[PDB]
Amino acid sequence: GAMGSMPTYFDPIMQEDTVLDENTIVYLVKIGDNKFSIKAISSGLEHLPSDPTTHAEKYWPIPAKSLIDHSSNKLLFEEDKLTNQPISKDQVIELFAVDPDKTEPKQFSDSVKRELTENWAREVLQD
Ligand code: NA
Ligand code: NA
């Protein structure tokens, strides 16, 4: 119509629909056997301990450009909004060229909680 649209995702960080661009953090998590979910967040890949909506600790990185280039695919987007429905391993291979069951995932870091714990312990023992 008169109004355009851009692909958006519901950002768990700010709890708001957010325009997807090349600065969006995008990754895959596994939520079941042959069931994977595409996630997008505005920040936090290096600081969060797990994925916000599933608390998955393991993920497969996906370039934002790959998701943007599929923005008209009805599997991933419904009315220009990122789907919350899972996709099969075959669909993952077809859309993103990654076999997750044959690729080592990355893991969210535990560094922030470790630093918090060390900060408390040092404060206890200082005067
Ligand atoms: Na954290
Ligand atoms: Na989290």
Residue numbers in the entry: -4 to 122
From the paper:
L. pneumophila encodes molecular mimics of host E3 ligases, including the effector protein RavN, thereby subverting the ubiquitylation pathway for its own benefit during infection. Using protein crystallography, we show that the fold of RavN has only residual resemblance to conventional eukaryotic E3s, yet its mode of interaction with E2 enzymes, host proteins that are important for the ubiquitin transfer reaction, has been preserved throughout evolution. When using RavN (Lpg1111; 212 amino acids, 24 kDa), a translocated substrate of the Dot/Icm Type IV secretion system (T4SS), as bait, a protein of approximately 35 kDa in size was highly enriched in the pulldown fraction but not in the control lanes. While control reactions lacking either GST-RavN or an E2 underwent no noticeable poly-ubiquitylation, efficient poly-ubiquitylation was detected upon incubation of GST-RavN with the E2 enzymes UbcH5a, UbcH5b, UbcH5c, and UbcH6, but none of the other E2s, indicating that RavN was indeed an E3 ubiquitin ligase that preferred a select set of host E2s.
Thus, we carried out limited trypsin-mediated proteolysis in combination with Matrix Assisted Laser Desorption/Ionization–Time of Flight (MALDI–TOF) mass spectrometry to identify stable fragments that may be more amenable to crystallization. The U-box domain resembled the zinc-finger-containing structure present in all RING domains, but lacked the Zn2+-coordinating sites which are substituted by a network of stabilizing hydrogen bonds and salt bridges. In fact, for all active RING-finger/U-box domains, the L1E3, L2E3 and αA elements create a conserved hydrophobic surface that serves as the docking site for E2 binding, as investigated for RavN below. The remaining three alpha helices (α1, α2 and α3) and the connecting loops (L5 and L6) are folded as a “cup” or “goblet” (colored slate in Fig 3A) that surrounds the base of the U-box domain. Superimposition of their structures with that of RavN revealed the presence of three residues in RavN (Ile8, Leu43 and Pro47) that create a surface area analogous to the E2 binding regions present in Ark2C and CHIP, suggesting that these residues could be important for E2 binding and, thus, E3 ligase activity of RavN. Notably, owing to crystal packing, helix α3 adopted multiple orientations among the three RavN1-123 molecules present within the asymmetric unit. The angles between different orientations of helix α3 ranged from 56° for α3A∠C to 134° for α3A∠B and 137° for α3B∠C.
